[PDB]
Amino acid sequence: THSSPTATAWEIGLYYELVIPKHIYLNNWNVVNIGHLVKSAGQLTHVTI
């Protein structure tokens, strides 16, 4: 906004985005599906939920 050899001035525009939480969850586990093998009319088959 101003530029002398002994003086300066600047302006900065900052925009902020604050997420407001509804609930916070701390003690958490990841799921790992393993399933089960089934041997049916000769064929081996992997079964999963």
Partner: peptide, 17 residues
């Protein structure tokens, strides 16, 4: 040929999860 044994424990995984 001498009898030597190792212990092996096993547990289940309900629903396979």
């Amino acid at each position: 040929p001498v009898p030597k044994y190792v212990e092996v424990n096993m547990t289940s995984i309900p629903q396979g999860v």
